[PDB]
Amino acid sequence: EEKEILWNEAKAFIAACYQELGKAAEVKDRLADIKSEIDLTGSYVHTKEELEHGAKMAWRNSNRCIGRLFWNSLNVIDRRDVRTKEEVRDALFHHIETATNNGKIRPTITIFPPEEKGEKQVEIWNHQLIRYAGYESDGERIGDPASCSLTAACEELGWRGERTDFDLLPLIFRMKGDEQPVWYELPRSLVIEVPITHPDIEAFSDLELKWYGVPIISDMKLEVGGIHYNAAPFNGWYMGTEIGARNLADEKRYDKLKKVASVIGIAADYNTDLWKDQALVELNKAVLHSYKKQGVSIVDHHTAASQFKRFEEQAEEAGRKLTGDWTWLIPPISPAATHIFHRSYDNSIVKPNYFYQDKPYE
Amino acid sequence: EEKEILWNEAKAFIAACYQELGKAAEVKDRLADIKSEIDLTGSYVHTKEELEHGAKMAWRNSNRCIGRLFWNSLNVIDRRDVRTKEEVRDALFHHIETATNNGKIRPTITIFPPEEKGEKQVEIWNHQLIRYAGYESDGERIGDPASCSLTAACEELGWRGERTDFDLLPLIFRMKGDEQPVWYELPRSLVIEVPITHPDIEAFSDLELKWYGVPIISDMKLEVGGIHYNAAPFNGWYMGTEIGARNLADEKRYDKLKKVASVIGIAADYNTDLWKDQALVELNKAVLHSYKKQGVSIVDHHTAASQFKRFEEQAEEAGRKLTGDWTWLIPPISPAATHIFHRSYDNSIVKPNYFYQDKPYE
Ligand code: HEM
Ligand code: HEM
Numbered sequence A, B: 001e002e003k004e005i006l007w008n009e010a011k012a013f014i015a016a017c018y019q020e021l022g023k024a025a026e027v028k029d030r031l032a033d034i035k036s037e038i039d040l041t042g043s044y045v046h047t048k049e050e051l052e053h054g055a056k057m058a059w060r061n062s063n064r065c066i067g068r069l070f071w072n073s074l075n076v077i078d079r080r081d082v083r084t085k086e087e088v089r090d091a092l093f094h095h096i097e098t099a100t101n102n103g104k105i106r107p108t109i110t111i112f113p114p115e116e117k118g119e120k121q122v123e124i125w126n127h128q129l130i131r132y133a134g135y136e137s138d139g140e141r142i143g144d145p146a147s148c149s150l151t152a153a154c155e156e157l158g159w160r161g162e163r164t165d166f167d168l169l170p171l172i173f174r175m176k177g178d179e180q181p182v183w184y185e186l187p188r189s190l191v192i193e194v195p196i197t198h199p200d201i202e203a204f205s206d207l208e209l210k211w212y213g214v215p216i217i218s219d220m221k222l223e224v225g226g227i228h229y230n231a232a233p234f235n236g237w238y239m240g241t242e243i244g245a246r247n248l249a250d251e252k253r254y255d256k257l258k259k260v261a262s263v264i265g266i267a268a269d270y271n272t273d274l275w276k277d278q279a280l281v282e283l284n285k286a287v288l289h290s291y292k293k294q295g296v297s298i299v300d301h302h303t304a305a306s307q308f309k310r311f312e313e314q315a316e317e318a319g320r321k322l323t324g325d326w327t328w329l330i331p332p333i334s335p336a337a338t339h340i341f342h343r344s345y346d347n348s349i350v351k352p353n354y355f356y357q358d359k360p361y362e
């Protein structure tokens, strides 16, 4: 009965994948092999080529992602061979190093062994491989509030954060058969961070803001042809607004706009002064300037949207339907200055794709 | 068969309206009267109380409107008595005067006789009662491009614009029985305009921008209990972003951001400088400042969103379902700085409501 769902997903993915790779004549034989393998084993194993193209298709199909123009150049690392926690750890360290690439970020995914009977082989607890801790007790808020529950779970396991506003969380994951996850402190030499300064307001450095170089999302499930790769961290480079208009700006995150207004020398008293808007613009200029000055890849929302327009044009030319989530594609500052705001998108879900999955803590 | 649809809409509206007005015991008798009236005449006539509350309910139910907190104070002018084009003209002139109210804008609707057999009694061609003309010929663009087709239709009728960037279109409407609409130049004494200046950048006035004081939307159909009031112009006061982030900023409108960047002294060369964002913020500050300085009502998007939060809270307390269109409620600048961006809304259509209808020209 589950062999049923699997086989159907397999037929659809292999046909599509092989068409795209110019291997259409190999489909019959490959599906025959797949069919025996499911019958006998309950599952099937992707070839390296299928897995690579599958991860790339999954990015291409991610409705909420504005960065999809570059789907075909995703660097896919096949780590289906790992069996021990040390191998998982070192694969994760390697992903950070190779993705970071001295600042010239390479969009990369590392793919771990997939679920078997819906049994995870490896279960990653981090939201991103590099992320700051958050604390709150006695009204006192420190660090990143979005990290509060994982931070508390880490401190249940014997880790202790220094309680700066920018503590790096350890890697934390659980192996099949183990009751508890293990954790490993990140080697600081692997983690690039960028201090936030402003191109012409010298006092901006008084805020002592920084952010990390590479967002490596590690809690989503990659699904390809019926196979569920629950552990498959991936990364791009940041779009500036993610950091300047959300991470550093949201009231439920670092909540810095009032402090930004003060250092740029404007009053934060009247809604009609649009001081939040002005502060947002200067904070976002600072983030882009700072990443560029440090030689870490980043894209601004205008350039990103113009890349996405090319992705739309490419989809049409290739004869593929385009799907998108308008509510996530529009950037959180000046959305009406992008073409995205002025058209609509079909939010249908197409596989292969990346999906949310339940948190193992909380 | 149409008596069927009408009667059903009537039952639902009268029951709801009368509950809200504390008149629930009068429903049976009123519906009885309505039922005879439909049988004998094919339609029914709203009482002044029903029409007033109906227009207010229609505003309350307008999913795309952020200004709905004030739905219950709408000033409803009943002009179902008009029969001649001079009466229509003078009703429209009066609406402008009373809505404008020397700058202290009163949200107002003037309701004209409704459709009969789906036959319009009065057909208004203007999109808004006050709006600028637009022209394009030989690559030359003048005025408001969104007004190009109505401008051309007006010039078919013997009107001629001066071809400034801010020509006021005449009122234009057609009476039942007439083959062509008539047009009337707006008396300039009735129309408040606001020159756009900046609170601290003196050169901003070099752009010679202005906008009109009151948006009076005149091409939507009000539907109340099965009755179709196709001619029922209404107005609020502006939210600043409508003017500063869209009318004056959109590339397909006045397209002023490059000129704004120049007068505020920033380069418009690099996407990473966020010059469009900075220009948008200063243009939007200027619009709010200018309206305030002239004593014409206006609201900024932050205050508007906080009013809308109160509307949401009021709906819950009153036990009413809330409906909304997230894609229109978020403002076009700093949307993530409003609570609207961070929740979702049910976009279901509830009547009474305002609806689009087909243009009579083009
Ligand atoms: C190359 C640079 C990239 C840029 C600039 C980019 C940009 C973005 C942005 C701005 C978002 C919205 C995030 C948010 O608001 O939380 C996003 C969402 C997303 N991106 Fe990309 N992206 C890139 C690469 C990638 C890659 C390599 C993948 C996967 C292979 C990916 C998959 C996704 C997915 C799945 C989401 C949606 C996440 C969710 O629903 O929570 N992106 N992207
Ligand atoms: C009192 C001040 C008001 C403010 C500040 C306000 C604000 C707004 C804004 C900003 C929009 C979006 C417009 C756009 O992007 O084109 C809007 C839409 C709308 N408003 Fe309001 N509004 C107000 C009063 C009213 C009144 C009095 C009515 C009717 C009685 C009304 C009915 C609507 C409708 C129907 C729409 C949607 C129009 C469409 O779909 O094209 N509003 N409002």
Ligand SMILES: Nc1ccc2ccc(CCNCCc3cccc(F)c3)cc2n1
Pocket (backbone or CB within 6 Å): A067, A127, A146, A215, A217, A235, A236, A237, A238, A239, A242
């Ligand atoms: N620049 C990029 C590249 C790839 C990305 C891939 C995924 C994402 C989504 C990250 N945010 C998901 C929503 C979320 C989850 C958990 C906490 C939050 F604050 C927000 C962002 C990306 N940004």
Ligand SMILES: Nc1ccc2ccc(CCNCCc3cccc(F)c3)cc2n1
Pocket (backbone or CB within 6 Å): B067, B127, B146, B215, B217, B235, B236, B237, B238, B239, B242
């Ligand atoms: N401030 C207000 C108050 C009431 C309003 C009622 C309705 C509207 C919608 C006006 N715009 C409709 C969309 C449209 C139509 C025609 C040309 C355009 F450029 C845009 C705006 C309002 N703004």
Ligand SMILES: C[C@H](O)[C@H](O)[C@H]1CNc2nc(N)[nH]c(=O)c2N1
Pocket (backbone or CB within 6 Å): A327, A328, A329, A330, B341, B342, B343, B344
């Ligand atoms: C409620 C709302 O739809 C939702 O919280 C979204 C809106 N659009 C977004 N878009 C992006 N890119 N990221 C987000 O976190 C959100 N939040």
Ligand SMILES: C[C@H](O)[C@H](O)[C@H]1CNc2nc(N)[nH]c(=O)c2N1
Pocket (backbone or CB within 6 Å): A341, A342, A343, A344, B327, B328, B329, B330
């Ligand atoms: C395509 C897109 O959904 C659409 O053009 C909308 C987006 N949201 C909007 N929201 C408002 N308030 N006004 C508009 O004109 C638009 N344009």
Ligand SMILES: [Cl-]
Pocket (backbone or CB within 6 Å): A215, A242, A247
């Ligand atoms: Cl992030």
Ligand SMILES: [Cl-]
Pocket (backbone or CB within 6 Å): B215, B242, B247
């Ligand atoms: Cl307008």
